[PDB]
Design a protein around this ligand. Structure first.
Ligand SMILES: Cc1cn([C@H]2C[C@H](OP(=O)(O)O)[C@@H](COP(=O)(O)O)O2)c(=O)[nH]c1=O
Length: 129
């Protein structure tokens, strides 16, 4: 896989980010994660964590997987990095998202994210408390 730069337009919520990617605005859905909705327990925390990780970063990068690059809603599907740290992974590591929507073709980082979720769950952290 490879990491491409992008410029932040809007950190939308826990699972999506709007970026200027090669000069065009697109909404990216984070691969492999599902975040509690804002009006559910941990929703507001999970959303603010995601937003601030992205917004505080100097460098934002997009990393497409080996399968489809857009979902059935027209969203880009990617791993997003914030100063070299994977946003998808951190959300899960901190017990503020769950590993989810793991399709063939776009599962490169599945083992890594499941490792993070296992640590969160062992620690009974946040959604796992
Ligand atoms: C993460 C991800 C979500 N999606 C779609 C599947 C879900 O649609 P369906 O429920 O219609 O299947 C939806 C979940 O996204 P949200 O969690 O943003 O709603 O996003 C994909 O198609 N591929 C993906 O990799």
């Amino acid at each position: 896989l490879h990491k491409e730069p992008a410029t932040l337009i809007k950190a939308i919520d826990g699972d999506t980010v709007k970026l200027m990617y090669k000069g065009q605005p697109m909404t990216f859905r984070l691969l492999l994660v599902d975040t509690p909705e804002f009006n559910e327990k941990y929703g507001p925390e999970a959303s603010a964590f995601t937003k601030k990780m992205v917004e505080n970063a100097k460098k934002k990068e997009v990393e497409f997987d080996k399968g489809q690059r857009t979902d059935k809603y027209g969203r880009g599907l990617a791993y997003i990095y914030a100063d070299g740290k994977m946003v998808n992974e951190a959300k899960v590591r901190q017990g503020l998202a769950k590993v989810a929507y793991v399709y063939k073709g776009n599962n490169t980082h599945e083992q890594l994210l499941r490792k993070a979720e296992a640590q969160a769950k062992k620690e009974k952290l946040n959604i796992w408390s």
